[PDB]
Ligand binder design. Structure first.
Ligand SMILES: Nc1ncnc2c1ncn2[C@@H]1O[C@H](CSCC[C@H](N)C(=O)O)[C@@H](O)[C@H]1O
Length: 327
DNA sequence: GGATGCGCTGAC
DNA sequence: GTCAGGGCATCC
């Protein structure tokens, strides 16, 4: 993550729904905002959250009385995406994990915060012929909010990972916010090899598959894209190897394969998956962030997380817009 | 819970 | 046609 000198959100309260690792909390706090409530039902996610923020998020949001939630200015929610991912069955609102947005709507209807800041996977924008995005838009508008949605790729904001997500920012209409803008992209100057730990710390992550098929030559010149160098098995998810001179393949929460969750990388002549700390770095988390003791759970958490830097730029812009109140 | 072979849609 | 997409099925 980056340093934010002008605290655009100082004095503003926000809630951390579907908290996870608390990526929204890190981003919003770096801009000066104060967290007044967090909710996350996964046991291990609650543990890592408490380990880093000192509080256990409340459980199952579908069972929380929206009226009990503290007053706040900004509602943050990177709600579940398994039901909208191209990797899944895409059942959307017909999936038990695909109706959480309506819980958000229920909370917004009651608390009416100045801003609703949501995030989901890129495919969310075109899921079900775009009908899914339209439902969220209509819902937000009927709740009396504007709706700004855009798919952003982490590689355009200083993070060496090809991770496209949709970001949805909504302003309460009475605020008359007319100048919100999504961050403008900038040249990437960091690559996977720049975030790697020393070899002595990741020997256990080395995988030697005798069915490895190198499909391309390694590159010496860094590039802002994923560069596949080979495959293992049938080359399915988790069986693909990339160059550390390019950017990271998108981390996964429920992904499989011998290189599950992180994908494989060619490092000093060997093929290995990433270490939880390297996953934290490709997601923009500071090295001071404490990862969950269970590597399996840590990989899951990071594969579900938000890219901090991207949220920081957006949060800064949200604050910038809220602060422009000329006579 | 941990691990991994897989399935197959879809962006372009 | 290529290969990415940040899940599913099932074993212990
Ligand atoms: N009904 C429910 N109540 C509370 N939390 C829920 C929930 N359904 C899903 N979740 C939680 O929603 C999260 C979505 S992933 C969001 C991760 C978060 N932005 C962070 O930065 O890492 C998951 O951690 C999941 O356990």
């Amino acid at each position: 993550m980056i340093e934010i000198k002008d605290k655009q959100l100082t004095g503003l309260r926000f809630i951390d729904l579907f908290a996870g690792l608390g990526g929204f909390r890190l981003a919003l706090e770096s801009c000066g905002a104060e967290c007044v409530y967090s909710n996350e039902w996964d046991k291990y996610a609650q543990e890592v959250y408490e380990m880093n923020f000192g509080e256990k998020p409340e459980g199952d949001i579908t069972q929380v009385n929206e009226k009990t939630i503290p007053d706040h200015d900004i509602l943050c929610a990177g709600f579940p995406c398994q039901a909208f991912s191209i990797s899944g069955k895409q059942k959307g609102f017909e999936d038990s994990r695909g109706t959480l947005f309506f819980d958000i709507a229920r909370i917004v209807r009651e608390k009416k915060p100045k801003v609703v800041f949501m995030e989901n996977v890129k495919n969310f924008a075109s899921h079900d012929n775009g009908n899914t995005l339209e439902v969220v838009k209509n819902t937000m508008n009927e709740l009396d909010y504007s709706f700004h949605a855009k798919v952003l790729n982490a590689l355009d904001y200083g993070i060496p990972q090809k991770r496209e997500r949709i970001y949805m920012i909504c302003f309460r209409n009475d605020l008359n916010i007319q100048n919100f803008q999504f961050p403008k992209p900038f040249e990437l100057n960091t690559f996977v090899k720049d975030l790697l730990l020393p070899d002595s710390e990741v020997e256990h992550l080395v995988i030697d598959r005798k069915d490895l098929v190198m499909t391309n030559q390694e590159i010496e010149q860094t590039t802002p894209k994923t560069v596949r160098l080979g495959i293992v098995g049938k080359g399915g998810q988790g069986e693909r190897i990339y160059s550390t001179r390019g950017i990271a393949i998108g981390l996964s929460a429920y992904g499989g394969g011998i290189f599950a969750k992180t994908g494989g990388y060619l490092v000093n002549g060997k093929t290995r998956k990433l270490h939880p700390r390297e996953c934290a770095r490709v997601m923009g988390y500071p090295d001071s962030y404490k990862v969950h003791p269970s590597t399996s759970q840590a990989y899951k958490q990071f594969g579900n997380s938000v890219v901090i830097n991207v949220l920081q730029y957006i949060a800064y812009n949200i604050g910038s817009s809220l602060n422009f109140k000329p006579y």
